[PDB]
Scaffold this active site. Structure first.
Site, PDB file in Angstrom:
ATOM      1  CD  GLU A  11      -2.984  -1.089   0.323  1.00  0.00           C
ATOM      2  OE1 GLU A  11      -3.790  -1.978   0.162  1.00  0.00           O
ATOM      3  OE2 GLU A  11      -3.076  -0.007  -0.404  1.00  0.00           O
ATOM      4  CG  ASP A  20      -8.083   3.644  -3.854  1.00  0.00           C
ATOM      5  OD1 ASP A  20      -8.700   2.955  -3.061  1.00  0.00           O
ATOM      6  OD2 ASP A  20      -8.635   4.058  -4.941  1.00  0.00           O
TER       7      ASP A  20
HETATM    8  K   LIG Z   1      -2.210   2.537  -1.841  1.00  0.00           K
END
Ligand SMILES: [K+]
Ligand SMILES: [Cl-]
Ligand SMILES: [Cl-]
Length: 164
Positions: A11, A20
């Site tokens: 992430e 994202d």
């Molecule tokens: K991310």
């Protein structure tokens, strides 16, 4: 290697609100703020999560605080889900982390829907589960990440994360 290190690689770490892979406002280590297209709405979620009027930027310590909460919540979600718990309980610790990773990324509901893959995992049919897992929107949209998680389920080792 462990769930925290694994997800930190998958992430990344960003201290200002960003979008994202799905285009959704997020911050820190993959902390999804909202699916709303309103930046204001995302900022309000951020302040509520952190407990202060932030202006869209947080500190590293604050990012790690939400991350810990998020990992804990994913584990919690699995343990409360009738579809996921048994699979989780049947796995070794390495593979367990792979399942937590998927839930962190897609949510309890999302992962609970991978019924056939889940069954293959419970049966310990590693290679078959890996092939099945790849036949998904998840794999197509985030193939490198998916591949890492899948190799983890396939092998029960951290080889996909070693050397990153
Ligand atoms: K991310
Ligand atoms: Cl939160
Ligand atoms: Cl990816």
């Amino acid at each position: 290697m462990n769930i925290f290190e694994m997800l930190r690689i998958d992430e990344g770490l960003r201290l200002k609100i960003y979008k994202d892979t799905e285009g959704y406002y997020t911050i820190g280590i993959g902390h999804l703020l909202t699916k709303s297209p309103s930046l204001n709405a995302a900022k309000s979620e951020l302040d509520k999560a952190i407990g202060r009027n932030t202006n869209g930027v947080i500190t590293k310590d604050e990012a790690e605080k939400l991350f810990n909460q998020d990992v804990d919540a994913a584990v919690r979600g699995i343990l409360r889900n009738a579809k996921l718990k048994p699979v989780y309980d049947s796995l070794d610790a390495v593979r367990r982390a792979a399942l937590v990773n998927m839930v962190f990324q897609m949510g309890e509901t999302g992962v609970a829907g991978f019924t056939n893959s889940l069954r293959m995992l419970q049966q310990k049919r590693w290679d078959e589960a890996a092939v099945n897992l790849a036949k998904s929107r998840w794999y197509n949209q985030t193939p490198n990440r998916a591949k890492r998680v899948i190799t983890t389920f396939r092998t029960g080792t951290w080889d996909a994360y070693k050397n990153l």
